[PDB]
Design a binder for this molecule. Sequence first.
Ligand SMILES: *[C@@]12=NC3=[C]C([C])=C([C])[C]=C3N([C][C]([O])[C]([O])[C]([O])[C]OP([O])([O])=O)C1=NC(=O)[N]C2=O
Length: 109
Amino acid sequence: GLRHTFVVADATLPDCPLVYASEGFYAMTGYGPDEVLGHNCRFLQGEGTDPKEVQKIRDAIKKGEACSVRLLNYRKDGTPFWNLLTVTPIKTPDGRVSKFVGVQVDVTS
Ligand SMILES: *[C@@]12=NC3=[C]C([C])=C([C])[C]=C3N([C][C]([O])[C]([O])[C]([O])[C]OP([O])([O])=O)C1=NC(=O)[N]C2=O
């Protein structure tokens, strides 16, 4: 299929820290696990990131809904790329959100 990356965020912590990332994510972004795990995904954002889209994900996470936004992100070396990003809430049987899982596709084409 298409080249994509995958992460898991822990929603049982107040600021959805990332707890797992596929090989592709580290390779796409240039950041290592020591700089990715424990942190919130937003460190990939920068000057040109549309705050109206950042808002759509903030709201969707607060409400525990899925969400798909297209964000401008930056690699560790500062070069930008276009991140088509899809967040999925993972609920426990009691209805609580336990994790958010994300598929991120570099759609710079
Ligand atoms: C990021 N991917 C990503 C993956 C998951 C599973 C989740 C839950 C979030 C992201 N983000 C966004 C970030 O964590 C945050 O949710 C939003 O920026 C909005 O909240 P704030 O407090 O910042 O307004 C991702 N952000 C990226 O920029 N790139 C991704 O790959």
